[PDB]
């Protein structure tokens with residue numbers, strides 16, 4: 099892995115449950131068989147969406163957690179773990195959504211204004227999730243829902259491994275900037291979602307608060323705004339994305355736009371920890387969507403990320419760190435293209451996120467964006483997950499591997515692995531001062547023969563006089579590896595004469611020793 103280390107010793111594999119209810123897709127008895135089978139294939143837990151539209155359907159405080167409880171009983175029966183997702187977002191409408199579960203309709207009647215939903219640059223209304231600006235309603239409803247859910251799941255705390263919060267559309271912390279109805283679907287540039295009267299006045303009040311008066315605003319922006327009502331979000335999203343963002347006005351607007359998401363994160367994080375910490379004591383996570391298109395577009399840099407609310411990832415991650423939430427990033431199965439017209443740089447994105455995350459000490463998890471039906475993708479996920487310190491990986495979705503033993507088998511081999519600590523020893527390595535020793539091997543866990551940035555470093559054992567290291571390897575997998583010396587200047591000086599192997603890596607910790 100990067101910086102001379104190995105895979106994450108806490109790595110776990112998860113599987114996404116169907117979007118629809120189990121009894122609508124199969125039956126409980128079969129479901130339990132399926133779970134035992136998944137467990138057999140290296141899956142640690144099943145992530146599942148518990149829809150707000152189901153749990154508080156008829157009215158305020160008119161809760162129905164019967165399905166969630168029944169589901170948990172079967173998970174318990176199958177000897178598995180579960181990761182519930184408190185889905186305060188609508189099912190149906192997003193990529194891969196085979197369902198139709200909008201949020202509770204009575205919720206919209208809580209306000210007279212347009213504070214609860216979204217309005218795009220072109221007037222498109224979005225109601226698949228509550229606008230984070232309506233923090234008063236969010237604090238009430240999410241607080242009530244999180245607290246009620248905790249009470250209902252208290253009996254099944256032992257099968258709950260983690261809890262996911264829905265920070266926005268499709269369960270990710272973002273704005274609904276890319277939709278068919280808004281004409282912003284992939285690979286197009288996204289549209290800003292702050293055109294409701296409520297959003298306009300909020301930005302305006304935010305600016306006035308920062309500068310005090312219009313006279314100070316105009317000074318800061320080098321503008322000639324006539325009245326305070328002239329303080330508004332981007333009139334032309336395209337021009338803003340081309341050059342507008344570079345001005346003091348553009349920077350302030352982007353600061354506010356993303357800030358709303360940061361504040362939302364700290365809010366739901368606070369509510370979640372208050373409702374779950376004493377009872378479950380499990381990690382709580384939230385997701386950041388992988389908006390890879392229009393990444394390296396020369397005319398509109400990040401034309402899809404910015405409208406989604408992603409301006410400064412470093413600042414955004416700081417919000418997760420503060421809210422004490424683990425982060426989950428999507429798109430691990432894809433690679434960079436960076437060509438017209440899509441300008442997709444998915445792999446680059448993940449690398450920066452991972453680097454930032456690990457840099458801030460944030461626990462990182464990942465998931466695939468689209469259904470995988472080819473082992474090559476699994477291999478791509480493996481390289482990222484095992485070299486960028488991912489604590490977990492979630493496979494979308496259930497039906498893909500549950501009904502395809504071939505894919506299932508490949509998943510087991512490549513990703514359904516158990517990390518085990520082992521000791522690697524190399525005898526009589528011809529080194530001189532300035533020389534460091536490393537090992538690299540065939541599997542992704544071993545850096546895939548890479549000597550540049552993924553090799554695993556070994557250290558000299560003063561006592562016994564040999565180079566050795568405590569490396570984390572996948573248990574019960576056949577591996578091939580070779581040690582090599584790297585000079586003080588960072589270049590490979592030499593290689594171990596014979597290629598080493600461990601067929602397979604033992605489940606119990608021990609050591610592999612060989613001479614140079």
Ligand SMILES: *[C@@H]1O[C@H]1CO[C@H]1O[C@H](CO)[C@@H](O)[C@H](O)[C@H]1O
Nearest residue numbers: 114147189192193195268269270
């Ligand atoms: C964007 O979690 C990523 C995938 O989103 C889809 O699956 C989610 C998990 O099952 C679900 O929450 C979301 O509604 C669906 O579109």
Ligand SMILES: [Ca+2]
Nearest residue numbers: 158159239242
């Ligand atoms: Ca309520």
